[PDB]
Write an enzyme that holds these catalytic residues in place. Structure first.
Site, PDB file in Angstrom:
ATOM      1  N   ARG A  59       0.914  -1.187  -0.037  1.00 38.94           N
ATOM      2  CA  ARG A  59       0.057  -0.083   0.043  1.00 38.94           C
ATOM      3  C   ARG A  59       0.997   1.452   0.068  1.00 38.94           C
ATOM      4  NH1 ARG A  59      -2.271   1.301   6.077  1.00 38.94           N
ATOM      5  NH2 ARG A  59      -0.254   1.098   7.155  1.00 38.94           N
ATOM      6  N   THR A 109       7.851  -2.274   8.346  1.00 40.46           N
ATOM      7  CA  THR A 109       8.364  -1.835   9.724  1.00 40.46           C
ATOM      8  C   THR A 109      10.135  -1.745   9.689  1.00 40.46           C
ATOM      9  OG1 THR A 109       6.259  -1.933  10.680  1.00 40.46           O
ATOM     10  CG2 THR A 109       8.127  -1.747  12.152  1.00 40.46           C
ATOM     11  N   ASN A 113      11.971   1.349  11.718  1.00 42.15           N
ATOM     12  CA  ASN A 113      12.240   0.832  13.440  1.00 42.15           C
ATOM     13  C   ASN A 113      13.658   1.151  13.870  1.00 42.15           C
ATOM     14  OD1 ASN A 113      14.082  -0.975  12.458  1.00 42.15           O
ATOM     15  ND2 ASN A 113      12.775  -2.778  12.617  1.00 42.15           N
ATOM     16  N   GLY A 115      16.209  -0.574  14.500  1.00 38.96           N
ATOM     17  CA  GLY A 115      17.281  -1.390  13.924  1.00 38.96           C
ATOM     18  C   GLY A 115      17.853  -2.479  14.726  1.00 38.96           C
ATOM     19  N   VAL A 116      17.274  -2.730  16.024  1.00 34.43           N
ATOM     20  CA  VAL A 116      17.973  -3.757  16.729  1.00 34.43           C
ATOM     21  C   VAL A 116      17.664  -5.005  16.114  1.00 34.43           C
ATOM     22  CG1 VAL A 116      18.231  -4.720  19.200  1.00 34.43           C
ATOM     23  CG2 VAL A 116      17.576  -2.233  18.771  1.00 34.43           C
ATOM     24  N   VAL A 220      -4.768  -3.266  -1.081  1.00 40.14           N
ATOM     25  CA  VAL A 220      -5.408  -4.593  -1.142  1.00 40.14           C
ATOM     26  C   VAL A 220      -6.669  -4.654  -0.052  1.00 40.14           C
ATOM     27  CG1 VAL A 220      -5.379  -7.133  -0.837  1.00 40.14           C
ATOM     28  CG2 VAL A 220      -3.458  -6.047  -1.760  1.00 40.14           C
ATOM     29  N   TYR A 456       5.824  -0.583  23.330  1.00 37.69           N
ATOM     30  CA  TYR A 456       7.222  -0.995  22.941  1.00 37.69           C
ATOM     31  C   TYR A 456       7.231  -1.109  21.284  1.00 37.69           C
ATOM     32  CZ  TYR A 456      11.784  -1.953  24.248  1.00 37.69           C
ATOM     33  OH  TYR A 456      13.309  -1.746  24.330  1.00 37.69           O
ATOM     34  N   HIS A 458       6.190  -3.512  19.510  1.00 43.34           N
ATOM     35  CA  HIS A 458       6.537  -4.750  19.050  1.00 43.34           C
ATOM     36  C   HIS A 458       4.955  -5.709  19.292  1.00 43.34           C
ATOM     37  CE1 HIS A 458      11.018  -4.741  20.414  1.00 43.34           C
ATOM     38  NE2 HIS A 458      10.812  -3.842  19.347  1.00 43.34           N
ATOM     39  N   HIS A 496      13.190  -8.454  20.659  1.00 42.62           N
ATOM     40  CA  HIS A 496      13.350  -7.510  19.484  1.00 42.62           C
ATOM     41  C   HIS A 496      13.066  -8.510  17.937  1.00 42.62           C
ATOM     42  CE1 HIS A 496      15.424  -4.766  22.076  1.00 42.62           C
ATOM     43  NE2 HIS A 496      14.840  -3.927  21.555  1.00 42.62           N
ATOM     44  N   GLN A 498      12.082  -8.294  14.795  1.00 42.77           N
ATOM     45  CA  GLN A 498      12.275  -8.153  13.324  1.00 42.77           C
ATOM     46  C   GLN A 498      13.035  -9.392  12.856  1.00 42.77           C
ATOM     47  OE1 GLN A 498      14.258  -4.997  11.279  1.00 42.77           O
ATOM     48  NE2 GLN A 498      16.083  -4.646  12.830  1.00 42.77           N
TER      49      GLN A 498
HETATM   50  C1  LIG Z   1       8.873   2.489  15.565  1.00 43.08           C
HETATM   51  C2  LIG Z   1       8.987   1.131  15.606  1.00 43.08           C
HETATM   52  C3  LIG Z   1      10.190   0.366  16.277  1.00 43.08           C
HETATM   53  C4  LIG Z   1      10.511  -0.751  16.282  1.00 43.08           C
HETATM   54  N1  LIG Z   1      11.839  -1.322  16.483  1.00 43.08           N
HETATM   55  C5  LIG Z   1      12.055  -2.589  16.551  1.00 43.08           C
HETATM   56  C6  LIG Z   1      13.740  -2.904  16.583  1.00 43.08           C
HETATM   57  O1  LIG Z   1      14.453  -2.070  16.890  1.00 43.08           O
HETATM   58  N2  LIG Z   1      13.943  -4.118  16.564  1.00 43.08           N
HETATM   59  C7  LIG Z   1      12.836  -5.090  16.381  1.00 43.08           C
HETATM   60  O2  LIG Z   1      13.359  -6.183  16.261  1.00 43.08           O
HETATM   61  N3  LIG Z   1      11.646  -4.810  16.171  1.00 43.08           N
HETATM   62  C8  LIG Z   1      11.207  -3.317  16.273  1.00 43.08           C
HETATM   63  N4  LIG Z   1       9.998  -3.198  16.106  1.00 43.08           N
HETATM   64  C9  LIG Z   1       8.941  -4.140  15.845  1.00 43.08           C
HETATM   65  C10 LIG Z   1       9.003  -4.890  14.435  1.00 43.08           C
HETATM   66  O3  LIG Z   1       9.845  -3.930  13.541  1.00 43.08           O
HETATM   67  C11 LIG Z   1       7.897  -5.409  13.978  1.00 43.08           C
HETATM   68  O4  LIG Z   1       7.009  -5.968  14.708  1.00 43.08           O
HETATM   69  C12 LIG Z   1       7.757  -6.065  12.806  1.00 43.08           C
HETATM   70  O5  LIG Z   1       8.956  -5.541  11.865  1.00 43.08           O
HETATM   71  C13 LIG Z   1       6.596  -6.509  12.082  1.00 43.08           C
HETATM   72  O6  LIG Z   1       6.503  -7.239  10.732  1.00 43.08           O
HETATM   73  P1  LIG Z   1       5.150  -7.483   9.977  1.00 43.08           P
HETATM   74  O7  LIG Z   1       5.899  -8.042   8.513  1.00 43.08           O
HETATM   75  O8  LIG Z   1       4.251  -8.294  10.665  1.00 43.08           O
HETATM   76  O9  LIG Z   1       4.565  -6.101   9.379  1.00 43.08           O
HETATM   77  P2  LIG Z   1       5.129  -4.797   8.550  1.00 43.08           P
HETATM   78  O10 LIG Z   1       6.828  -5.084   8.534  1.00 43.08           O
HETATM   79  O11 LIG Z   1       4.501  -3.646   9.384  1.00 43.08           O
HETATM   80  O12 LIG Z   1       4.645  -5.204   7.281  1.00 43.08           O
HETATM   81  C14 LIG Z   1       3.399  -4.992   6.715  1.00 43.08           C
HETATM   82  C15 LIG Z   1       3.187  -4.280   5.470  1.00 43.08           C
HETATM   83  O13 LIG Z   1       1.918  -4.381   4.925  1.00 43.08           O
HETATM   84  C16 LIG Z   1       1.404  -3.430   4.206  1.00 43.08           C
HETATM   85  N5  LIG Z   1       0.038  -3.392   4.379  1.00 43.08           N
HETATM   86  C17 LIG Z   1      -0.707  -3.362   5.190  1.00 43.08           C
HETATM   87  N6  LIG Z   1      -2.023  -3.502   5.002  1.00 43.08           N
HETATM   88  C18 LIG Z   1      -2.194  -3.568   3.578  1.00 43.08           C
HETATM   89  C19 LIG Z   1      -3.078  -3.762   2.563  1.00 43.08           C
HETATM   90  N7  LIG Z   1      -4.189  -3.933   2.940  1.00 43.08           N
HETATM   91  N8  LIG Z   1      -2.580  -3.815   1.198  1.00 43.08           N
HETATM   92  C20 LIG Z   1      -1.348  -3.585   1.039  1.00 43.08           C
HETATM   93  N9  LIG Z   1      -0.190  -3.340   1.865  1.00 43.08           N
HETATM   94  C21 LIG Z   1      -0.756  -3.351   3.193  1.00 43.08           C
HETATM   95  C22 LIG Z   1       1.922  -2.410   5.193  1.00 43.08           C
HETATM   96  O14 LIG Z   1       2.267  -0.891   4.811  1.00 43.08           O
HETATM   97  C23 LIG Z   1       3.570  -2.812   5.340  1.00 43.08           C
HETATM   98  O15 LIG Z   1       4.384  -2.406   4.678  1.00 43.08           O
HETATM   99  C24 LIG Z   1       9.576  -1.977  15.939  1.00 43.08           C
HETATM  100  C25 LIG Z   1       8.269  -1.338  15.353  1.00 43.08           C
HETATM  101  C26 LIG Z   1       7.907  -0.076  15.634  1.00 43.08           C
HETATM  102  C27 LIG Z   1       6.828   0.366  14.969  1.00 43.08           C
HETATM  103  C1  LIG Z   2      14.367   2.757  23.222  1.00 41.81           C
HETATM  104  C2  LIG Z   2      14.016   3.824  22.527  1.00 41.81           C
HETATM  105  C3  LIG Z   2      12.606   3.582  22.300  1.00 41.81           C
HETATM  106  O1  LIG Z   2      14.546   3.484  21.218  1.00 41.81           O
HETATM  107  C4  LIG Z   2      14.325   4.532  20.393  1.00 41.81           C
HETATM  108  C5  LIG Z   2      14.523   6.048  20.925  1.00 41.81           C
HETATM  109  C6  LIG Z   2      14.755   7.096  19.959  1.00 41.81           C
HETATM  110  C7  LIG Z   2      14.945   8.298  20.443  1.00 41.81           C
HETATM  111  C8  LIG Z   2      15.054   9.417  19.293  1.00 41.81           C
HETATM  112  O2  LIG Z   2      14.532  10.388  19.755  1.00 41.81           O
HETATM  113  C9  LIG Z   2      14.643   8.530  21.519  1.00 41.81           C
HETATM  114  C10 LIG Z   2      14.338   7.526  22.614  1.00 41.81           C
HETATM  115  C11 LIG Z   2      14.520   6.186  21.968  1.00 41.81           C
HETATM  116  O3  LIG Z   2      14.084   5.036  23.148  1.00 41.81           O
END
Ligand SMILES: Cc1cc2nc3c(=O)[nH]c(=O)nc-3n(C[C@H](O)[C@H](O)[C@H](O)COP(=O)(O)OP(=O)(O)OC[C@H]3O[C@@H](n4cnc5c(N)ncnc54)[C@H](O)[C@@H]3O)c2cc1C
Ligand SMILES: CC1(C)OCc2cc(C=O)ccc2O1
Ligand SMILES: *[C@@H]1O[C@H](CO)[C@@H](O[C@@H]2O[C@H](CO)[C@@H](O)[C@H](O)[C@H]2NC(C)=O)[C@H](O)[C@H]1NC(C)=O
Ligand SMILES: *[C@@H]1O[C@H](CO)[C@@H](O)[C@H](O)[C@H]1NC(C)=O
Ligand SMILES: *[C@@H]1O[C@H](CO)[C@@H](O)[C@H](O)[C@H]1NC(C)=O
Ligand SMILES: *[C@@H]1O[C@H](CO)[C@@H](O)[C@H](O)[C@H]1NC(C)=O
Ligand SMILES: *[C@@H]1O[C@H](CO)[C@@H](O)[C@H](O)[C@H]1NC(C)=O
Ligand SMILES: *[C@@H]1O[C@H](CO)[C@@H](O)[C@H](O)[C@H]1NC(C)=O
Ligand SMILES: *[C@@H]1O[C@H](CO)[C@@H](O)[C@H](O)[C@H]1NC(C)=O
Ligand SMILES: *[C@@H]1O[C@H](CO)[C@@H](O)[C@H](O)[C@H]1NC(C)=O
Length: 518
Positions: A59, A109, A113, A115-116, A220, A456, A458, A496, A498
């Site tokens: 999307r 994501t 995210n 990066g961890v 979709v 978190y 996650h 973590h 990912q």
């Molecule tokens: C801000 C943030 C920081 C994070 N930091 C970390 C970290 O440092 N390390 C770690 O291990 N985990 C981290 N996580 C968690 C981890 O990144 C996620 O749990 C994981 O990436 C989820 O993968 P997924 O494939 O389930 O979802 P996603 O990677 O979100 O993939 C789903 C995809 O489907 C698409 N999509 C959704 N609905 C539709 C539709 N109807 N049609 C078409 N496309 C669609 C979305 O746009 C998206 O690209 C973080 C999460 C966030 C939000």
């Molecule tokens: C542990 C966790 C959530 O990782 C990412 C993070 C990023 C910023 C940047 O402003 C600040 C705090 C922070 O904490």
């Protein structure tokens, strides 16, 4: 650790087979359709494309449109940026009142995210009861790690926090390790040592460019089914102009939903796969009754304190983890800001930092508390669904937050953290705090946990193995339909996740190719 990536530019070579969903020549029959070009979906589509014709539908747009997604330094920017419906960060608020985000971009994501990178807790596989090919799991981790994971360089704040975790008794010292194990370690990162972000989109480079097509800004809206031996046969997607498109699978092919914890249950419910009474009440025709679609949705709590050292600290990305069974701890150091990164703090009302700060964090495992995803619109997939996590509804989660917060107390008392105090007094009141400090019998820790909780990020669940899916990730009752993403498991694989979900995309891809092989 032979199997790690180098410092290198983000590899956009795959853009040679990425097209706008406005292109009607993408419409037609494939061997596989993967819905969601995210963490699991990218490596899944790349793997299936080794043998078969694959259409990946995302999307969001391409990451080159939002350059702040491609560096460590850009992490805050993408959360600070207003959600205009096109941005790579989509904002939401759970019905609990806790601000949150999800990805809307090719690479999912992994493009937004922190990066961890870690491998799953090696006990996770036997806990699931799935008959994993454990050798293949490890080869698939190495295939991901070779492409996008590095051993991080020293960062001064991460080294302080690691020394602190060790002094606070988070033992043993595991050194540099990708494994989720009790103790303190440096783990891997998908940010390289030049700060370039690497991500799941780069695993599309492992696909066969004669067999893989990617449609971006492809929303979709529905899974199409056979009319009678119930099979998924294809999808309806709309483009950025709002025009509709259809694609189908053929022969022994399959549709896989990889739309995430939020997007997968939403699309299943819109397609009539879900609880019979709920869907009937919305006049959505039931294709496959299943009481568990959008049920068992989880968000691991984040609880935190913020210290303001009297001398500047260097900003860092999280690389140093303090792991116990009952809590997972890290700390990031950040520049100040006057625009908050949305969802870092649980509401927009949170005080802003004027100087550099350390965000010091504990994550509740599981968690055991769960809620649900329900539809807001019964037709429009661009309208976010309702989501509720019921944070700390389960007293065990509250007990684990209390233990985590007492350990952050121990960490604030270490010699390691002493130089970051504003006053050289005996107590942890010698720190300057942004927001609420730690309060030491249990009632005050319980209030702190409940009142100061954040996501978190996650979150997981909504289409669980053993509830919606079988042990091969097939939707029960439907041929040619699977789900592969974080909707699939009720407990975290590690601190973590990912790493686990990147691995899972390719792994299930290899299971589908083996099942189909002669
Ligand atoms: C801000 C943030 C920081 C994070 N930091 C970390 C970290 O440092 N390390 C770690 O291990 N985990 C981290 N996580 C968690 C981890 O990144 C996620 O749990 C994981 O990436 C989820 O993968 P997924 O494939 O389930 O979802 P996603 O990677 O979100 O993939 C789903 C995809 O489907 C698409 N999509 C959704 N609905 C539709 C539709 N109807 N049609 C078409 N496309 C669609 C979305 O746009 C998206 O690209 C973080 C999460 C966030 C939000
Ligand atoms: C542990 C966790 C959530 O990782 C990412 C993070 C990023 C910023 C940047 O402003 C600040 C705090 C922070 O904490
Ligand atoms: C790794 O995952 C395991 C299995 O889920 C976690 O659970 C531990 O294992 C035993 C049985 O395997 C259970 O009684 C407990 O839930 C856990 N053990 C202890 C001593 O608490 C295990 O905790 C996870 N490890 C980490 C470090 O998170
Ligand atoms: C180092 O990072 C910089 C920061 O933009 C970037 O120009 C370059 O790609 C990196 N070096 C490489 C790829 O060797
Ligand atoms: C797709 O095409 C439309 C014009 O029809 C344009 O508005 C949109 O930005 C394009 N999207 C991408 C991702 O190229
Ligand atoms: C897989 O790798 C882990 C470390 O991540 C190791 O502990 C485990 O023994 C390996 N398992 C197999 C079956 O090789
Ligand atoms: C549809 O369902 C029937 C059950 O009556 C089943 O036997 C058949 O295989 C299916 N055929 C098609 C073309 O979908
Ligand atoms: C469902 O449709 C029936 C008409 O058959 C109507 O009585 C009912 O109000 C409808 N409910 C919803 C929620 O649309
Ligand atoms: C949809 O979301 C809005 C605002 O986010 C919410 O307040 C409203 O009640 C929801 N509607 C339905 C039908 O769930
Ligand atoms: C908490 O979670 C477990 C599920 O593991 C459940 O058995 C237990 O009864 C729940 N406790 C509460 C307070 O709901």
């Amino acid at each position: 650790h032979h199997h790690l990536a180098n410092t290198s530019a983000h590899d956009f070579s795959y853009l040679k087979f990425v097209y706008n969903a406005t292109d009607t020549s993408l419409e037609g029959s494939y061997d596989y359709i993967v819905i969601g070009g995210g963490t699991s979906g990218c490596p899944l589509a790349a793997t299936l494309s080794e043998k078969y014709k694959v259409l990946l539908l995302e999307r969001g747009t391409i990451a080159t449109e939002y350059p702040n997604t491609l560096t460590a330094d850009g992490f805050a920017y993408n959360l600070q940026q207003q959600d205009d419906g096109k941005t790579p960060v989509e904002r939401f608020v759970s019905e609990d009142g806790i601000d949150n985000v999800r990805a809307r971009i090719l690479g999912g994501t992994t493009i937004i995210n922190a990066g961890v990178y870690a491998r799953a807790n090696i006990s996770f596989y036997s806990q699931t009861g799935i008959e994993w090919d454990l050798d293949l799991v490890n080869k698939t981790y190495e295939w991901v790690e070779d492409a996008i994971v590095v051993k991080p360089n020293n960062q001064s704040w991460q080294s302080v926090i690691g020394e602190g975790f060790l002094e606070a008794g988070i033992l043993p010292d595991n050194g540099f390790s990708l494994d989720h194990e009790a103790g303190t370690r440096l783990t891997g990162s998908t940010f390289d040592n030049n700060g370039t972000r690497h991500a799941a989109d780069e695993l599309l480079n492992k696909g066969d460019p004669n067999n893989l097509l990617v449609a971006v800004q492809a929303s979709v809206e529905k899974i199409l089914f056979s009319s009678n031996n119930l099979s998924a046969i294809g999808v309806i997607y709309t483009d950025s102009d709002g025009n509709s498109h259809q694609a189908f699978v053929r022969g022994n092919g399959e549709v896989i939903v990889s739309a995430g914890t939020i997007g997968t249950p939403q699309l299943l419910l819109l397609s009539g796969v879900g609880p019979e009474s709920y869907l009937s009440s919305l006049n959505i025709t039931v294709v496959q009754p299943n009481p568990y679609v959008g049920q068992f949705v989880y968000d691991n709590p984040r609880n935190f304190i913020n210290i303001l050292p009297p001398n500047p600290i260097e900003a860092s990305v999280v690389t140093v983890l303090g792991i116990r069974s009952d809590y997972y701890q890290v700390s990031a150091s950040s520049l100040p800001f006057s625009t908050p990164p949305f969802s870092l703090f649980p509401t927009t009302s949170y005080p802003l930092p004027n100087s550099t700060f350390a965000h010091i964090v504990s994550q509740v495992p599981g968690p055991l508390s769960h809620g649900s995803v329900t539809l807001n619109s019964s037709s429009d997939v661009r309208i976010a669904p309702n989501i509720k996590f019921n944070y700390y509804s389960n007293s065990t989660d509250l007990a684990n937050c209390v233990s985590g917060m007492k350990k952050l107390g121990d960490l604030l008392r270490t010699k390691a953290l002493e130089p970051y105090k504003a006053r050289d007094v005996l107590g942890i009141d010698g720190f300057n705090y942004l927001g609420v400090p730690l309060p030491t019998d249990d009632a005050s820790f319980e209030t702190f946990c409940l009142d100061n909780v954040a996501s978190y990020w996650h979150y997981h669940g909504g289409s669980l193995v053993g509830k919606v899916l079988d042990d091969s990730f097939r939707v029960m009752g439907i041929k040619a339909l699977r789900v592969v993403d974080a909707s699939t498991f009720p407990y975290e694989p590690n601190s973590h996740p990912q790493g686990f979900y990147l691995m899972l995309g390719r792994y299930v891809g290899l299971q589908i190719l083996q099942e189909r092989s002669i």
